[PDB]
Paper text:
RAS proteins are binary molecular switches that cycle between active guanosine triphosphate (GTP)-bound and inactive guanosine diphosphate (GDP)-bound states. In the active state, RAS proteins interact with a variety of effector proteins, such as RAF kinase, PI3K, and RalGDS, leading to activation of downstream signaling pathways. The role of magnesium as an essential cofactor for small GTPases is well established as it is required for both high-affinity nucleotide binding and GTP hydrolysis. To examine the effect of N-terminal modification on the tertiary structure of KRAS, we carried out structural studies on KRAS constructs containing iMet (unprocessed N-terminus), lacking the iMet (partially processed N-terminus), and KRAS lacking the iMet and with N-acetylation of the second amino acid (fully processed N-terminus).
Numbering used by the authors: 0 to 169
Amino acid sequence: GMTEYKLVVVGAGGVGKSALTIQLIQNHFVDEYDPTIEDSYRKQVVIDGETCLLDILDTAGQEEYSAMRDQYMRTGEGFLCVFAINNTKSFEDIHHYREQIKRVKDSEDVPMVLVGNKCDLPSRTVDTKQAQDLARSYGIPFIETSAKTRQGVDDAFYTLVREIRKHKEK
Ligand SMILES: Nc1nc2c(ncn2[C@@H]2O[C@H](COP(=O)(O)OP(=O)(O)O)[C@@H](O)[C@H]2O)c(=O)[nH]1
Ligand SMILES: [Mg+2]
């Protein structure tokens, strides 16, 4: 039968992890969602003719115990690494997320997609070239998104599934 995949959405507080996840799951933009809530959601989709069940963890940062962070990174099969295009610190944080996930999984080959969110807002500080160069250095896709307009949202999640499939079918 069909397969379930564990996706994990990571990134600095305020980049739009919850807004992106809720758009995919519930098809609306949520303006105020408590930044300290971490929850998971299921969604069945068909990608490349094959039916999937996505189990998506919307992370929120520090855990009661760091061992719990390590556990969700170990069971996670692919990671949406989200920054906001108007927040340079959130982009620099991607370096740390890439390192930490590889470190916890003790692996050099971890499915990931780099997501630059909030493209509909003014005063961008992270240029597309910067992000394209970084994703290229990791060997992963880069997608620009807006949780408000839905630009790129489905693309980002479905591309991550394709990356998971490529890793498993190696
Ligand atoms: N304009 C705009 N605002 C966004 C976008 N994504 C998130 N936000 C806003 O950014 C703030 C933080 O988003 P949230 O989903 O809570 O970020 P999280 O802490 O990563 O889960 C909220 O006020 C959201 O409405 C976007 O693509 N465009
Ligand atoms: Mg959140």
